[PDB]
Amino acid sequence: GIDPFTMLPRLCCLEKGPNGYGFHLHGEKGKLGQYIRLVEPGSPAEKAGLLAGDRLVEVNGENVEKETHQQVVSRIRAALNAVRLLVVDPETDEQLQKLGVQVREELLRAQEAPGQA
């Protein structure tokens, strides 16, 4: 039997503290997405569940799957006191996308009957 879903994306809501959010975001050359480069131990970023390796899929509520470092930062600026980061394990993202499911948010919703229904 095949598992339709596995280790799905997570919208991580973290708050801006004395050191910002305590995470370093970078866009890998060759690729067209943003990834968690570093999580500063003791930051609210850890509390939200950010791990160095997760792919940034969405920011606050704006899709940044294919968006550039500058484009995401601009969306990050729209965070008043706290930012919502939608992230998923990079290997899983590609396989789940092959299933045609919108990893950005619809996946988190459609945990009830896999799909838009």
Side-chain angles (χ1 to χ4, degrees):
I2 304 299
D3 295 284
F5 275 126
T6 178
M7 310 307 176
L8 34 287
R10 179 181 60 259
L11 186 65
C12 310
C13 309
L14 51 157
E15 302 174 87
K16 200 187 74 181
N19 55 28
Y21 294 95
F23 77 97
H24 295 226
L25 185 69
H26 85 123
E28 292 188 52
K29 179 183 182 182
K31 281 70 65 170
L32 68 162
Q34 299 304 275
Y35 306 93
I36 304 292
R37 207 285 292 169
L38 173 68
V39 187
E40 312 272 39
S43 60
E46 308 187 295
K47 310 180 188 184
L50 298 178
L51 192 152
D54 299 313
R55 178 190 181 171
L56 183 61
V57 181
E58 177 150 311
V59 182
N60 286 280
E62 225 301 277
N63 187 270
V64 301
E65 289 178 45
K66 323 300 192 302
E67 255 41 275
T68 55
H69 184 86
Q70 191 184 210
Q71 285 179 89
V72 295
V73 174
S74 304
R75 289 152 169 88
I76 299 175
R77 299 300 183 202
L80 299 180
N81 77 91
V83 64
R84 298 179 174 159
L85 299 176
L86 199 293
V87 298
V88 59
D89 290 86
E91 302 172 289
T92 311
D93 166 76
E94 302 183 309
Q95 65 185 89
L96 294 185
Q97 289 199 31
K98 290 180 180 61
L99 305 171
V101 188
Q102 303 79 210
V103 180
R104 57 159 300 243
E105 175 188 16
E106 295 302 281
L107 211 165
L108 294 79
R109 304 175 59 202
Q111 292 298 274
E112 308 171 87
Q116 285 68 269

